[PDB]
């Protein structure tokens, strides 16, 4: 965007080579809002619960919650961060398959009422320390196998515990849409099975792994259509755990250069750069505008190796790099974008 | 490690599931001293400089500096930490190929007199902001380029400290490749006195240190030449021991025989219970943090979370939250 480029340049001008930091973040408030209203439009029946683990930055977590998003917390620290921002503990879901005893007890005292289980031991762990917490069964390491579902449901019933419903999380190898279709059908069967156990499961957590099925508008339409076709009980509500989807367009990294090496190899020179970070995606050189024939060279950018991209020859201390749409798991001053 | 086992089992018996921590560290002071004296006994002509980047934990960094070790710092934070512990800036070497301008200017004021280079640009940077700082050339295209950099060092009027490289017979080639560079630089009108062989140590060690010490003599470096190294994993490994607690268990029958998964806070031991020969063993998988991560797939007996713990021997190598100093 042009507004992001101009705001970055206005901030870069405040620095000389001697005083320039490793980099700075740009908080795209409109980028967060556009992602939320896009979700609410395409998936009306599924309320998004942001995975705080993806990006626990106070401003983003605050903004998302104010926009009506729920909260997906993996640890007690993530639980406490949400509660400190003034959000109600009912909107929080303690999504941790194996919880530390001290944290599980503290969560109960803090007012947390929703958690996830994928083992017979965790059912007993909850029954012993916080037996009032609602339990969600995780289906498909990480998850519960087909035959084990009955053994766990029996244990939840035998311990007299509350079942909120079913949960599933797909891997990083999402891409194929039909895995969500199968997992929802598998979840629908788990509901009717649990209903026979005398339980009333009202919550289906479809998990995360979004923005990995590209035509989102269409991918959201398929989930929405499948939800209707499976005919879930009238009382059932649907939540998701989108992390990468919400956090991506939230932040923009603007890094500085503090190293250069020109190396002619196999006939043509490649230029190595060292960007503001320790040596251990797509970016552009914002400081100089490309005049078409600006002599583009294959550039290797180091943190170990953050980007291999076609870039014009840059001068360390003068030239800067903008990495568009970061914050997604990538988590040093943060400047809010003007709007 | 009978003494370490008893010190842990004592601290374990103090916790119940309700208040058990994720894990605690045991700082083996004796383990550091034995590793340091092993270096000096087997490699006397090479002075060890600890890579603070490997483990910047104050207890390790302070003890090593008292034992005679130098300091290898990759950033200004590592430089300042060493100086805050009360160490002479001469013992510190700013080992960073590409330094930020602000950090380099500050390092010059802090008293840092030694740094490394591998590119022609970094030479001009040091000449522009910290010209008094001594320079080391990096070796192993980066071979014919050595002549290009040395010319830039000379033309800017900078002090050449010597040659530095980072990787059994690979060291023999690298030390010889360094010796040929020294004579090359001497013909330019420069006097390289420092040779940094790098790290990656711990290999039989005793035999490895013998080949290095022998190769040093055969190459016949000038009388003034001093030898230094950057061992990280070597010094840090035996310094700390991790004692994890268990807060997750899952039983799963696999094709006939059961495998049990565990979630805790390489080699590990169930110190909470004694394993008398046959006490029933199971293919156990131990996990850590991150909910989508895998530390061990080891042969272990059945364990109960909250009751049973884990001891990971020699874990101080690259980790960096509670430290218990091992007696005595």
């Amino acid at each position: 965007s042009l507004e992001v480029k101009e705001f970055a340049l206005n901030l870069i001008s405040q620095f000389e080579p001697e005083n320039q930091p490793l980099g700075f973040w740009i908080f795209d408030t409109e980028g967060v809002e556009k992602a939320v209203e896009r979700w609410k439009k395409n998936m009306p029946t599924v309320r998004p619960c942001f995975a705080v683990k993806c990006n626990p930055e106070p401003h983003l977590v605050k903004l998302l919650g104010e926009l009506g998003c729920g909260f997906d917390c993996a640890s007690l620290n993530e639980i406490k961060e949400v509660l400190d921002l003034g959000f109600n503990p009912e909107d929080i879901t303690y999504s941790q398959t194996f919880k530390p005893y001290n944290q599980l007890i503290e969560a109960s005292h803090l007012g947390i009422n929703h958690t996830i289980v994928d083992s017979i031991d965790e059912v007993q762990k909850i029954a012993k320390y916080a037996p009032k917490m609602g339990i969600m069964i995780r289906i498909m390491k990480f998850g519960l196998h087909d035959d084990e579902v009955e053994i766990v449901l029996k244990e939840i019933k035998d311990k007299g515990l509350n079942l909120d419903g079913v949960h599933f999380h797909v891997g990083s190898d999402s891409h194929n849409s039909e895995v969500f279709t199968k997992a929802l059908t598998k979840a629908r069967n788990t509901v009717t099975l649990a209903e026979q156990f005398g339980m009333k499961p009202y919550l289906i957590d479809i998990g995360g792994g979004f923005s990995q099925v590209a035509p989102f508008e269409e991918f959201a339409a398929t989930i929405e259509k499948t939800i209707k076709e499976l005919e879930f009980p009238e009382r059932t509500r649907f939540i998701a755990e989108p992390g990468r989807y919400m956090a991506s367009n939230a932040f923009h990294l603007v890094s500085s250069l503090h190293g250069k090496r020109v190396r002619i190899q196999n006939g043509k020179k490649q230029i190595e750069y060292t960007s503001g970070d320790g040596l251990h995606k797509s970016c552009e050189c914002i400081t100089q505008k490309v005049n078409e024939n600006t002599k583009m060279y294959e550039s290797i950018i180091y943190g170990d190796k953050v980007a291999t991209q076609e870039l014009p020859e840059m001068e360390p201390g003068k030239d800067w790099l903008l990495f568009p749409n970061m914050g997604a798991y990538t988590i040093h001053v943060i400047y809010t974008l003007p709007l």
Side-chain angles (χ1 to χ4, degrees), chain A residues 44-334:
Chain A
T45 56
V46 184
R47 184 194 169 176
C49 300
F50 176 72
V52 189
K53 198 182 184 290
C54 192
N55 198 332
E57 205 275 88
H59 298 125
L60 175 64
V61 181
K62 186 85 168 185
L63 182 67
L64 284 160
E66 282 175 13
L67 285 160
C69 288
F71 296 97
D72 194 61
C73 303
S75 64
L76 178 64
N77 282 181
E78 290 178 28
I79 285 168
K80 289 195 80 180
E81 196 208 309
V82 176
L83 289 165
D84 286 346
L85 292 167
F87 300 112
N88 202 65
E90 287 290 320
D91 298 318
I92 305 166
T93 170
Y94 193 13
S95 63
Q96 181 55 238
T97 50
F98 295 106
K99 300 164 279 292
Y101 301 96
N102 51 75
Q103 291 181 35
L104 179 59
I105 294 161
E106 186 64 23
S108 185
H109 297 318
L110 259 38
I112 304 303
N113 201 52
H114 306 299
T115 188
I116 302 169
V117 159
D118 66 339
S119 69
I120 189 162
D121 183 60
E122 203 78 16
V123 176
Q124 296 167 340
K125 183 189 285 175
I126 285 161
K128 196 184 174 184
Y129 297 95
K132 281 191 176 180
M133 204 170 290
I135 295 161
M136 232 187 306
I137 191 158
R138 184 165 178 170
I139 63 105
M140 288 170 72
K141 63 176 176 71
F142 280 99
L144 190 73
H145 293 307
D146 292 289
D147 57 339
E148 290 169 23
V149 183
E150 278 174 294
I151 299 296
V152 175
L153 278 171
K154 181 180 165 67
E155 190 71 26
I156 302 164
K157 198 196 171 181
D158 294 352
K159 288 285 176 287
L161 299 162
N162 309 130
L163 186 83
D164 288 337
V166 192
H167 161 79
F168 65 91
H169 201 282
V170 296
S172 299
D173 53 297
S174 304
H175 312 295
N176 175 272
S177 189
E178 221 81 58
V179 293
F180 273 83
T181 316
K182 200 175 186 179
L184 279 166
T185 314
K186 189 176 165 174
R188 182 70 196 92
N189 297 315
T190 312
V191 172
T192 44
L193 181 63
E195 276 186 317
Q196 285 183 311
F197 273 77
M199 297 160 172
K200 303 278 170 69
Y202 75 99
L203 197 63
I204 302 298
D205 199 326
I206 60 165
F210 294 94
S211 74
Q212 213 61 237
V213 189
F216 180 77
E217 327 286 318
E218 296 192 321
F219 178 56
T222 55
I223 304 163
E224 195 65 38
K225 192 165 170 282
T226 313
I227 286 304
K228 274 193 170 187
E229 287 168 355
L230 288 164
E231 290 185 7
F232 282 88
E234 209 271 311
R235 45 154 163 79
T236 57
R237 300 292 170 268
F238 302 95
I239 55 165
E241 296 172 355
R244 178 180 279 270
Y245 173 82
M246 300 290 185
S248 65
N249 307 315
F251 292 95
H252 305 288
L253 183 67
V254 190
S255 303
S256 61
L257 295 168
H258 58 92
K260 196 173 85 175
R261 181 162 68 175
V262 178
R263 181 166 284 169
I264 317 95
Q265 193 188 351
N266 289 321
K268 227 291 177 74
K269 51 207 279 176
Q270 53 165 24
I271 317 167
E272 285 166 48
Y273 294 96
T274 309
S275 175
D277 253 1
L279 64 305
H280 202 131
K281 236 282 176 183
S282 298
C283 71
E284 51 173 76
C285 179
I286 261 65
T287 41
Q288 54 179 211
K289 200 266 170 71
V290 49
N291 38 288
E292 190 79 308
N293 294 47
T294 330
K295 298 92 74 186
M296 258 63 178
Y297 302 101
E298 182 185 25
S299 302
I300 304 280
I301 315 154
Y302 299 117
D304 193 39
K305 195 178 179 182
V306 287
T308 299
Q309 207 164 12
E310 188 91 331
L311 279 160
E313 192 187 37
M314 291 178 285
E315 186 179 303
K318 195 265 180 180
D319 287 292
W320 284 65
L321 275 64
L322 165 69
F323 295 87
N325 310 313
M326 299 291 286
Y329 279 108
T330 58
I331 184 71
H332 58 277
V333 189
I334 307 160

